[PDB]
RNA sequence: GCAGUCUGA
DNA sequence: CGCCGCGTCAGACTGCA
DNA sequence: AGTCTGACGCGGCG
């Protein structure tokens, strides 16, 4: 987004900053939820082939 | 101000002023439930249209016909409390008339011989309580609403991911809210295709062909005709001119004189101009421009009646010349240039193996109902079913709007099923977005997506339920027993209150409530679930369904959903987000007008908002309502910019609007990271009630309305006087001009006392009001669980200082000063529910008694002579709570065995101890016993004994009902004496059962008179009749579970304290485990001898930027600062002038903030009061985006007299020293998360095993043994354990001859394992055997 | 075990749909066909006979009915799992592989040579093992041993199922059923339609699903296997076989306690009691204090303060195995001795806590007691927490100040 | 790749405990073959001690004294 | 610090060495007070100049 | 024993 | 076009043959 | 077998 957010958290994030802020944050933590998956099933093959 | 509000007034930091007050929050369930059980004479909601979309029923052959003219819903037989009590569900009976006509065959039209109607009784339908909770089987659930993709027609692609090329291929699909799927589809090869119902895909124009559509007609329907008309030679073809736009020639075009473009020219938009402003009416071009176009007609010879050339073929010389001499001087031709048009219709028209409407429908039912051959009876009769039928498919009123709305139609209502025209232009629609004309829809988007919720849901299961009913019925109304046959004969309610009782009881929506708290039961009340039936399911949703797309602002919540693997899929409806009367969820904004920002509020749905230019709520605006900047940030078309201050059009009417309820309640959330934000949203609701509920010093003063809006609190439902109040009831004497006429006066609020939470922890109500106290309406009477005077208070306020502590905070740990373990201030009562199930069994019944074997007359001491715990005993681990023993058999004692019992001369007896015991580690006291008999059951001595406490707590409960209802009658009726006509001088004389009769003037007061004396008379009826109704209903029998005589259930009160281990958290995700119980003398304190109550980390803020917890710190310390200046103008006893003056002081700072508390208009008893109401610090509130500025905090700390650093120099409890640097000091609330270290240990050494596999078992409910999984394994494997992983595979688990061995060697001290084969690799082989494979092991 | 004998022959649906289909492979018979003449749509010759009716041609019943009288009985060409039985029984492996052996050496587009050499494989791997080809059609049905399918009585007075005793059930009434069709000798279409029924049975017992609709009795979900018993997740292999639940182990919540030394670790005093417990009753009897394992039970369930005396011995030098899940790595699982601490919660060096990856809010950890003396041997020398200072990815150390 | 170079082993035990069980266990019956624990799963699957570490001192004994 | 103790002195003197290591952040961290407040993010007074 | 739901790390 | 996979451990509650 | 069914994934692989 080409307007970037130009409050700090001392300062307030206003209710359109913080609204813009959470989808990153929710896209970190749905990858974050559904990338383990990934990591065990790789790890699991490598065991399983060595 | 109010009443129950100035007792403790917290001050609000808002700036904004409130536009709009928060909306009920749990009307979501409620209004929908209230529109499927309401009488709706329009029937369009609920039963009544579920009722008229299946009746009137006729019998196949028309010789009768039945139909619905009413319903109503009875009373339940038990109320909400007796059916939580019974254990069963709290439902209403439906009762609908159903009238039976009979008709003639002995007249032509029609005419009815006979009617008949009556009442029949189809399915209980289960009652929502008055808090949006269903009492299903005795515990209450919520059914959550539902997020789902709306019916309609959405447009959507996979942008490349495909064919390996980046072709975009366009696909529409029509979702009905029930029926067949129907999709179209491109191929890379631009044909289009048709899918019905996911299933392998057709060319497209079989479903054209299955209508009733030649190619002809197709080919007008999907195309434009240009014409070819030889009127000497040499290709005269008519031109409308902007068709050969970006087309270019290898020919010149001239018409009429003036060439326009040269071969091998393209023709330019100045050159369009050029053949527009010379009225062009035709153009001859060469003749090889024939060959590659297409014929738009089937052309037939008219000299000798040949097949010239079928439709849809491409034209060439020979053929243009075979057209030519049969006399066709007309030709007609599809209009295919590319890049504004296309073929696609043409070639999908040469794919399609079909040439007429038969063998569209064999084809397609082929495709359906593959291995069948086809039959056109059947095939016909089934395609008609699949999309024009209204018993197969429906597509909803909403279906019907978003198709027209999609589709650009005019009209939103219609027919709910499919038409020619509505796939033709769904069809269109998709060529259009191939070529350019249009865009493809975003799934996500909440326009798009629709709340679905209890009382649709319910009206679903309703009308699947009534469906099986009418299949039913109208086969059996085509018997012979027609005139003697009535309606109930017919109706088999089963069906109904199968399908209702299913979905309610057992669907995916229905969840068991979470009752932490009251924020735990509003938060689950206001789910927005993704999955359930009609749904995504958890795995299989994506990652662009999960995220936070930009129409969620308002609409729902961008940061309360749950971290797990449903992240993004369970969402949190905000705060004043609703829904339209389809579904989509709206919010309110305040309409601007020419720059004037009104306070008229329009809700607007997530696409008409896309529309408008939406200011934010942080906008700032002058007296008279202008922006007062000239460029105001907005958002238009989901985008966010700045504007100018005319072209808004909209603007937000709150800054909390875009938050939900649970996100709303933490402070200072604009400096939280939304990751943090997140976690304290969801960890908010995890936090137990304590002992005693303590408000939060900072707030954001929707602790209220959270409070308020659920059912914990009993609020008052009439203005009044506090008659009287008691641990256990409020009886408030309404006003004067609150009570109906003819009305004792007097409502009584029965509190609810030590009752079980589903999670097992406590929920009291306490007495708020005291007597003689004036309650306004709408006061809370009484605090629930977590609230605190009325406010929702969930944690308590402990002195935080934020440092490093010898490593007893290390990584997210929390070091507690003892005094908060002595001041009982996180101690919890949890109340756990023990059955004891008297089963009947085949070698006899078991029985309760306290003369089971086996066990001494030490462990015995706490059972009556029944059998059964006293209530008030103190029990611990093991306590036998209710004796029980068993009729056993199969002993068989072993020989050394036979001579011991021999030796010491008795045999075992012939039962078995089954008895209830205390759990190990759970140790509390027995605080209510409840025993349940089979009806026919002998009920033993203390089965009675509990029936006559009942049968006189019932007589004694509306006798005081009664006592009070008649008292308040008397009084007014006094009143109505000394209001006129004064009988004064002998009303001190009369006894009160003369009063009702006494003469007055005889216009109006005589009138009321014999009101009141009816009412009173009224109250004794009833209440005469309704003590032998709960007579009954105590007396009877219970209606128990098949082969159960007699069930206990014993309630265990376990006041829990706090320890090492037990999870404690801010409202900003900064959870933590406590590590120590400091002592008191060695927590730091500052030069006033005080000692810090818990020590947090310093480390944990940077990282994770939760900064409003610094902030909170800051002005918790602050808010407390003010406290502290009270409890010393209290202890100095100060006069009221200068508390007053102070309390004003302190009310009156901040920077223009929204609130004014005039003091001066409160009562010097008022304010002593609002004063010991502070003196535990002043609450404050610092609501969502618009919270407290630092430099208000700062001042406010300056009024306290404490520094406005924020920080304080402290000394060390051990050794007596100054910490070298100052240090945060501040008043935290922390929360107590339900993740106790009681409910969390396990040890097991030995216990029972699986059945199969010889394994332990799981869980400490079954004693468990943890799972060496296979990540487990392979890290023994990476060391070189291979004896510990032996030890692991063999011995403690599977080994069954292996274990034993093992165990006796331990005991033998002899630490040597014997390991054989596991029991699961011999059931593995058995497994492989009972294929057809021969595993074998070989030596 | 049991067996049921199947009255007539049944086509292992291992064999006939896990692709490649060995008896089509076999056959060199494509399995759309294959799968037509075992369900009893479409015939097959046997034997061709002087005629245009080669041996794996297939035949639709009304291309049959018409050539009952163009050959007479010359031939006979048959349906479901007695001719695929009667073809792979009649087929003959060393001289099929023989015959293939020059059609792979004289071929020069490989395209067919791959086919070629795939079959021979099987061919040569029929052979070379034991076996024959009329195995992979039942003839007779094992049973597993019923403690294996256990038909659990419940308290609440009732039997709860297995989902095999369901697909046994099920196989054992329709086999029975055309047991009597046999000697009713009634219509060959309905005991068409009975065969095709037990075979579609077999193959649900055997494995659900694999031809498409897959039965569910009572739950509207499909029924278990034998063959959903041994695969996935849930299966034997990765649940019962590859890891199991394990005695002598206990769970609890994590709390720091910094005072603690890089070997050793809280152990709740309530945990340690219950992990050690026949240590403590040998304990018990060795130093007199009880007589019987029944007398120092009830001592240990007393708990009498001799038993907190013989609880400190009895984990002395005894190293217990603390594993945080997920188990990432190699470190995931670290043998400390345990120091008895009052409360309930499981204390952990602070250093050890970035080679677990475990933080305090929350966390939970397993304990494990080596029993053997090479157990112990083996936690305390290759295991304990003062050997894993370093990192086994990298050379840089994993006990690292945080 | 890992996913075939393990279903490609020579164990079937090793093969059919990782996934793809109804492939694994249908070729190694049609080849009739033959599974000699010498990996460290097949030696987990049957209790035995694994051939690495504190086991493989046991694993040598083992075939020191049967191939003998 | 640690890997140079490794590397040069062997397990035993590192397997101390961390716990002394430990024992002594701890306690000067304690005695240190380090405290994070709302003034030590400290903004600078260009920032809403450069913005 | 299973399915569904929720939660924790 | 059909088949195969898609992390680990744990606690709780219902309803089910 | 009639559903007043569900579908409503994805990415390799053969
Ligand atoms: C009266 C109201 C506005 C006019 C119309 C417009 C949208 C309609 C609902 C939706 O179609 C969903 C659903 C379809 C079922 O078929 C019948 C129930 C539902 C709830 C409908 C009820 C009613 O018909 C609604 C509310
Ligand atoms: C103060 C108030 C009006 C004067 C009087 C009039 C009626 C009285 C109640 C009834 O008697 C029922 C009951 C009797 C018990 O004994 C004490 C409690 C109850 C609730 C009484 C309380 C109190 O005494 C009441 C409210
Ligand atoms: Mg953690």
């Known amino acids: 987004i080409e307007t970037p957010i130009t409050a700090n958290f001392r300062e307030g994030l206003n209710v359109l900053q913080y609204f813009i802020s959470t989808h990153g944050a929710r896209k970190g933590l749905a990858d974050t939820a559904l990338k383990t998956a990934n990591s065990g099933y790789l790890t699991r093959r490598l065991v399983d082939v060595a | 101000y109010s009443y129950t509000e100035k007792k403790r007034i917290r001050k609000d930091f808002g700036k904004r002023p409130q536009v709009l007050d928060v909306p009920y929050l749990l009307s979501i369930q409620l209004d929908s439930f209230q529109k499927f059980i309401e009488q709706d004479p329009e029937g369009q909601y609920g039963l009544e249209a579920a009722f008229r979309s299946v009746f009137p029923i006729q019998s196949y052959s028309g010789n009768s016909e039945l139909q619905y003219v009413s319903y109503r819903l009875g009373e339940p037989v038990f109320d909400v409390q007796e059916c939580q009590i019974r254990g069963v569900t709290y439902s209403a009976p439906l009762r609908v008339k159903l009238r039976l006509v009979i008709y003639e065959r002995e007249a032509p039209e029609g005419t009815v011989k006979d009617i008949k109607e009556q009442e029949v009784y189809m399915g209980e339908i289960p009652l929502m309580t008055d808090n949006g909770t269903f009492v299903i089987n005795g515990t209450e659930r919520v059914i959550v609403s539902q997020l789902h993709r709306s019916p309609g027609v959405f447009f959507d692609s996979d942008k490349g991911k495909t064919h390996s090329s980046g072709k975009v291929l366009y696909n529409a699909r029509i979702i009905p809210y029930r029926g067949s799927w129907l999709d179209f589809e491109f191929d890379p090869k631009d044909n289009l295709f048709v899918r019905i119902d996911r299933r392998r895909k057709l060319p497209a124009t079989i479903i054209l062909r299955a209508l009733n559509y030649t190619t002809e007609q197709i080919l007008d329907l999907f195309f434009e005709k240009v014409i070819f008309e030889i009127r000497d030679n040499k290709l005269q073809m008519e031109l409308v001119p902007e068709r050969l736009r970006g087309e270019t020639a290898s020919f010149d075009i001239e018409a009429n004189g003036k060439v326009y473009v040269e071969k091998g020219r393209r023709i330019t938009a100045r050159h369009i101009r050029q053949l527009e402003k010379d009225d062009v009416k035709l153009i001859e071009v060469p003749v090889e421009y024939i060959a590659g176009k297409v014929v738009a007609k089937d052309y037939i010879d008219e000299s000798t009646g040949e097949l010239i050339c079928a439709a849809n073929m491409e034209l060439s010389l020979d053929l243009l010349a075979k057209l030519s001499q049969s006399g066709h001087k007309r030709i007609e031709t599809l209009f295919t240039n590319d890049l504004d048009h296309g073929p696609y219709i043409s070639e999908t028209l040469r794919v399609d193996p079909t040439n007429d409407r038969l063998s569209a429908l064999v084809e397609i039912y082929r495709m359906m109902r593959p291995g069948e051959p086809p039959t056109r009876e059947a095939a016909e009769s089934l395609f008609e079913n699949l999309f024009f039928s209204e018993d197969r498919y429906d597509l909803s009123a909403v279906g019907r709007m978003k198709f027209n709305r999609s589709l650009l139609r005019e009209e939103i209502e219609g027919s709910g099923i499919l038409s020619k025209d509505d796939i033709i232009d769904v069809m269109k629609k998709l060529i259009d977005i191939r070529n350019g004309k249009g865009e493809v829809d975003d799934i996500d988007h909440l326009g798009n997506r629709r709340i679905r919720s209890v009382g649709e849901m319910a009206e679903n299961q309703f009308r699947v339920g009534l469906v099986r009913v009418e299949r039913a019925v109208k086969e059996r109304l085509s018997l012979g027993d027609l005139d003697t046959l009535m309606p109930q004969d017919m109706i088999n309610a089963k069906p109904i209150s199968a399908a209702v009782k299913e979905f309610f009881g057992s669907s995916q929506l229905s969840q068991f409530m979470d009752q932490n708290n009251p924020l735990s039961e509003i938060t689950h009340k206001r789910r927005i679930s993704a999955l359930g039936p009609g749904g995504l399911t958890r795995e299989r949703a994506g990652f662009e369904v999960r995220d936070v797309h930009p129409t969620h602002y308002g609409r729902v919540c961008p940061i309360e959903?749950?971290?797990?693997?449903?992240?993004?899929?369970?969402?949190?409806?905000?705060?004043?987000?609703?829904?339209?009367?389809?579904?989509?969820?709206?919010?309110?904004?305040?309409?601007?007008?020419?720059?004037?920002?009104?306070?008229?509020?329009?809700?607007?749905?997530?696409?008409?908002?896309?529309?408008?230019?939406?200011?934010?709520?942080?906008?700032?605006?002058?007296?008279?309502?202008?922006?007062?900047?000239?460029?105001?940030?907005?958002?238009?078309?989901?985008?966010?910019?700045?504007?100018?201050?005319?072209?808004?059009?909209?603007?937000?009417?709150?800054?909390?609007?875009?938050?939900?309820?649970?996100?709303?309640?933490?402070?200072?959330?604009?400096?939280?990271?939304?990751?943090?934000?997140?976690?304290?949203?969801?960890?908010?609701?995890?936090?137990?009630?304590?002992?005693?509920?303590?408000?939060?010093?900072?707030?954001?003063?929707?602790?209220?309305?959270?409070?308020?809006?659920?059912?914990?609190?009993?609020?008052?439902?009439?203005?009044?006087?506090?008659?009287?109040?008691?641990?256990?009831?409020?009886?408030?004497?309404?006003?004067?001009?609150?009570?109906?006429?003819?009305?004792?006066?007097?409502?009584?609020?029965?509190?609810?006392?030590?009752?079980?939470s589903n999670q097992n922890t406590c929920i009291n109500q306490m007495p708020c009001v005291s007597l003689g106290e004036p309650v306004e309406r709408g006061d809370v009477l009484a605090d629930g669980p977590s609230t605190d005077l009325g406010e929702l208070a969930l944690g308590q306020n402990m002195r935080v200082a934020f440092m490093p502590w010898n490593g007893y905070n290390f990584e997210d740990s929390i070091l507690v000063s003892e005094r908060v373990v002595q001041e009982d201030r996180f101690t919890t009562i949890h109340i756990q529910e023990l059955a004891c199930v008297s089963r009947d069994t085949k070698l006899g019944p078991e029985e309760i008694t306290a003369d089971?074997?086996?066990?001494?007359?030490?462990?015995?001491?706490?059972?009556?002579?029944?059998?059964?715990?006293?209530?008030?005993?103190?029990?611990?681990?093991?306590?036998?709570?209710?004796?029980?023993?068993?009729?056993?058999?199969?002993?068989?004692?072993?020989?050394?065995?036979?001579?011991?019992?021999?030796?010491?001369?008795?045999?075992?007896?012939?039962?078995?101890?089954?008895?209830?015991?205390?759990?190990?580690?759970?140790?509390?006291?027995?605080?209510?016993?409840?025993?349940?008999?089979?009806?026919?059951?002998?009920?033993?001595?203390?089965?009675?004994?509990?029936?006559?406490?009942?049968?006189?707590?019932?007589?004694?409960?509306?006798?005081?009902?009664?006592?009070?209802?008649?008292?308040?009658?008397?009084?007014?009726?006094?009143?109505?004496?000394?209001?006129?006509?004064?009988?004064?001088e002998k009303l001190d004389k009369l006894p009160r059962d003369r009063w009702l009769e006494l003469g007055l003037t005889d216009?109006?007061?005589?009138?009321?008179?014999?009101?009141?004396?009816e009412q009173y008379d009224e109250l004794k009826h009833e209440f005469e009749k309704k003590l032998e109704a709960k007579r009954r209903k105590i007396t009877q029998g219970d209606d128990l579970a098949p082969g159960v005589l007699k069930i206990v259930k014993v309630y265990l009160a376990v006041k829990r304290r706090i320890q090492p281990g037990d999870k404690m958290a801010g409202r900003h995700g900064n959870k933590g485990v406590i590590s120590k119980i400091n002592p008191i003398e060695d927590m730091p304190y500052d030069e006033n001898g005080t000692p810090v109550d818990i020590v947090l980390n310093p480390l944990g803020v940077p990282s994770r930027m939760n900064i409003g917890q610094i902030l909170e710190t800051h002005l918790g310390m602050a808010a407390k600062g003010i406290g502290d200046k009270i409890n010393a103008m209290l202890k100095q006893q100060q006069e009221v002038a200068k508390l007053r003056e102070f309390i004003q002081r302190a009310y009156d700072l901040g920077a223009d903030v929204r609130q004014k508390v005039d003091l001066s208009t409160?009562?010097?008893?008022?304010?002593?009061?609002?004063?010991?109401?502070?003196?535990?610090?002043?609450?404050?509130?610092?609501?969502?985006?618009?919270?407290?500025?630092?430099?208000?905090?700062?001042?406010?700390?300056?009024?306290?007299?404490?520094?406005?650093?924020?920080?304080?120099?402290?000394?060390?409890?051990?050794?007596?020293?100054?910490?070298?640097?100052?240090?945060?000091?501040?008043?935290?609330?922390?929360?107590?998360?339900?993740?106790?270290?009681?409910?969390?240990?396990?040890?097991?050494?030995?216990?029972?095993?699986?059945?199969?596999?010889?394994?332990?078992?799981?869980?400490?409910?079954?004693?468990?043994?943890?799972?060496?999984?296979?990540?487990?394994?392979?890290?023994?494997?990476?060391?070189?354990?291979?004896?510990?992983?032996?030890?692991?595979?063999?011995?403690?688990?599977?080994?069954?001859?292996?274990?034993?061995?093992?165990?006796?060697?331990?005991?033998?001290?002899?630490?040597?394992?014997?390991?054989?084969?596991?029991?699961?690799?011999?059931?593995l082989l058995k497994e492989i055997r009972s294929l057809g494979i021969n595993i074998e092991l070989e030596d | 075990m049991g067996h049921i004998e199947l009255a007539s022959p049944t086509a292992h649906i291992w064999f006939l749909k896990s692709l490649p289909s060995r008896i089509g492979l076999l056959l060199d018979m494509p399995l759309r066909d294959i799968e037509r003449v075992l369900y009893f749509e479409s015939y097959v010759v046997i034997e061709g006979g002087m005629t245009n009716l080669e041996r794996q041609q297939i035949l639709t019943e009304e291309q049959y009915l018409d050539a009952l009288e163009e050959f007479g009985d010359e031939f006979d060409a048959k349906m479901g799992a007695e001719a695929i039985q009667a073809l792979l029984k009649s087929m003959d492996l060393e001289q099929e592989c023989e015959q293939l052996r020059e059609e792979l050496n004289e071929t020069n587009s490989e395209t067919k040579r791959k086919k070629l050499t795939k079959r021979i494989k099987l061919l040569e791997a029929f052979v070379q093992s034991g076996n024959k080809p009329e195995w992979m059609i039942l003839?007779?049905?094992?049973?597993?041993?019923?403690?294996?399918?256990?038909?659990?009585?419940?308290?609440?007075?009732?039997?709860?199922?297995?989902?095999?005793?369901?697909?046994?059930?099920?196989?054992?009434?329709?086999?029975?059923?055309?047991?009597?069709?046999?000697?009713?000798?009634?219509?060959?279409?309905?005991?068409?339609?009975?065969?095709?029924?037990?075979?579609?049975?077999?193959?649900?017992?055997?494995?659900?699903?694999?031809?498409?609709?897959?039965?569910?009795?009572?739950?509207?979900?499909?029924?278990?296997?034998?063959?959903?018993?041994?695969?996935?997740?849930?299966?034997?292999?990765?649940?019962?076989?590859?890891?199991?639940?394990?005695?002598?182990?206990?769970?609890?919540?994590?709390?720091?306690?910094?005072?603690?030394?890089?070997?050793?670790?809280?152990?709740?005093?309530?945990?340690?009691?219950?992990?050690?417990?026949?240590?403590?009753?040998?304990?018990?009897?060795?130093?007199?204090?009880?007589?019987?394992?029944?007398?120092?039970?009830?001592?240990?369930?007393?708990?009498?303060?001799?038993?907190?005396?013989?609880?400190?011995?009895?984990?002395?030098?005894?190293?217990?195995?603390?594993?945080?899940?997920?188990?990432?790595?190699?470190?995931?699982?670290?043998?400390?001795?345990?120091?008895?601490?009052?409360?309930?919660?499981?204390?952990?060096?602070?250093?050890?806590?970035?080679?677990?990856?475990?933080?305090?809010?929350?966390?939970?950890?397993?304990?494990?007691?080596?029993?053997?003396?090479?157990?112990?041997?083996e936690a305390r020398a290759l295991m304990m927490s003062t050997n894993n200072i370093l990192s086994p990815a990298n050379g840089e150390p994993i006990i690292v100040p945080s | 790749g890992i996913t075939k170079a393990s279903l490609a082993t020579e164990s079937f035990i090793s093969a059919a405990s990782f996934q793809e069980t109804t492939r694994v266990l249908t070729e190694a019956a049609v080849a009739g073959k033959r599974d000699e624990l010498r990996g460290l799963k097949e030696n987990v699957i049957v209790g035995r001690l694994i051939p690495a570490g504190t086991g493989y001192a046991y694993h040598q004994d083992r075939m020191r004294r049967r191939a003998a | 610090m640690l890997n140079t103790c490794y590397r040069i002195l062997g397990l035993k003197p590192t397997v101390i060495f961390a716990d002394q290591i430990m024992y002594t952040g701890f306690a000067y961290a304690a005695r240190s007070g380090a405290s994070v407040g709302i003034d030590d993010m400290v903004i600078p007074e260009k920032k809403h100049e450069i913005i």
């Open chain 2, 1003 to 1013: 216009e109006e007061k005589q009138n009321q008179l014999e009101q009141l004396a």
């Open chain 2, 852 to 984: 089971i074997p086996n066990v001494g007359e030490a462990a015995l001491s706490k059972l009556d002579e029944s059998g059964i715990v006293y209530i008030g005993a103190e029990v611990t681990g093991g306590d036998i709570l209710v004796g029980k023993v068993t009729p056993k058999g199969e002993t068989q004692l072993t020989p050394e065995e036979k001579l011991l019992r021999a030796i010491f001369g008795e045999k075992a007896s012939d039962v078995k101890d089954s008895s209830l015991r205390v759990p190990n580690g759970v140790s509390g006291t027995v605080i209510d016993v409840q025993v349940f008999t089979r009806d026919g059951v002998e009920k033993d001595k203390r089965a009675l004994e509990i029936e006559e406490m009942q049968l006189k707590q019932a007589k004694k409960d509306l006798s005081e009902e009664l006592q009070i209802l008649e008292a308040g009658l008397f009084s007014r009726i006094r009143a109505v004496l000394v209001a006129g006509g004064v009988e004064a």
């Open chain 2, 1162 to 1323: 409160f009562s010097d008893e008022e304010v002593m009061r609002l004063a010991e109401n502070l003196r535990k610090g002043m609450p404050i509130a610092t609501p969502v985006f618009d919270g407290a500025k630092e430099a208000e905090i700062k001042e406010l700390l300056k009024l306290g007299d404490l520094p406005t650093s924020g920080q304080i120099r402290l000394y060390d409890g051990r050794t007596g020293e100054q910490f070298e640097r100052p240090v945060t000091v501040g008043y935290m609330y922390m929360l107590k998360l339900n993740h106790l270290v009681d409910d969390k240990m396990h040890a097991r050494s030995t216990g029972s095993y699986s059945l199969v596999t010889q394994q332990p078992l799981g869980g400490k409910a079954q004693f468990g043994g943890q799972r060496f999984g296979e990540m487990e394994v392979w890290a023994l494997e990476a060391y070189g354990a291979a004896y510990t992983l032996q030890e692991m595979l063999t011995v403690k688990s599977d080994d069954v001859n292996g274990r034993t061995k093992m165990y006796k060697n331990i005991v033998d001290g002899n630490h040597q394992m014997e390991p054989g084969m596991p029991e699961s690799f011999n059931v």
């Open chain 2, 561 to 756: 959903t749950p971290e797990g693997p449903n992240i993004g899929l369970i969402n949190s409806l905000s705060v004043y987000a609703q829904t339209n009367e389809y579904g989509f969820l709206e919010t309110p904004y305040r309409k601007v007008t020419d720059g004037v920002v009104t306070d008229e509020i329009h809700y607007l749905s997530a696409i008409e908002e896309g529309n408008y230019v939406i200011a934010q709520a942080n906008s700032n605006l002058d007296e008279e309502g202008h922006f007062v900047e000239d460029l105001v940030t907005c958002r238009s078309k989901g985008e966010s910019s700045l504007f100018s201050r005319d072209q808004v059009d909209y603007m937000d009417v709150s800054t909390q609007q875009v938050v939900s309820v649970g996100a709303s309640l933490i402070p200072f959330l604009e400096h939280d990271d939304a990751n943090r934000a997140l976690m304290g949203a969801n960890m908010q609701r995890q936090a137990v009630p304590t002992l005693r509920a303590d408000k939060p010093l900072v707030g954001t003063g929707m602790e209220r309305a959270v409070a308020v809006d659920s059912g914990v609190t009993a609020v008052a439902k009439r203005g009044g006087v506090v008659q009287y109040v008691d641990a256990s009831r409020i009886v408030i004497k309404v006003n004067e001009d609150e009570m109906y006429p003819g009305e004792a006066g007097i409502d009584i609020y029965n509190l609810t006392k030590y009752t079980r």
């Open chain 3, 139 to 377: 003839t007779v049905l094992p049973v597993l041993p019923p403690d294996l399918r256990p038909l659990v009585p419940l308290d609440g007075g009732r039997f709860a199922t297995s989902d095999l005793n369901d697909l046994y059930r099920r196989v054992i009434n329709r086999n029975n059923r055309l047991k009597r069709l046999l000697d009713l000798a009634a219509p060959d279409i309905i005991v068409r339609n009975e065969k095709r029924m037990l075979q579609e049975a077999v193959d649900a017992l055997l494995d659900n699903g694999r031809r498409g609709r897959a039965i569910t009795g009572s739950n509207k979900r499909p029924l278990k296997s034998l063959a959903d018993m041994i695969k996935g997740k849930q299966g034997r292999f990765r649940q019962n076989l590859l890891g199991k639940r394990v005695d002598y182990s206990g769970r609890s919540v994590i709390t720091v306690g910094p005072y603690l030394r890089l070997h050793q670790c809280g152990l709740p005093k309530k945990m340690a009691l219950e992990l050690f417990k026949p240590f403590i009753y040998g304990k018990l009897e060795l130093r007199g204090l009880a007589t019987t394992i029944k007398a120092a039970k009830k001592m240990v369930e007393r708990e009498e303060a001799v038993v907190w005396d013989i609880l400190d011995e009895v984990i002395r030098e005894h190293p217990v195995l603390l594993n945080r899940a997920p188990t990432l790595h190699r470190l995931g699982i670290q043998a400390f001795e345990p120091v008895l601490i009052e409360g309930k919660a499981i204390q952990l060096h602070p250093l050890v806590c970035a080679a677990y990856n475990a933080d305090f809010d929350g966390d939970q950890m397993a304990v494990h007691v080596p029993l053997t003396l090479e157990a112990q041997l």
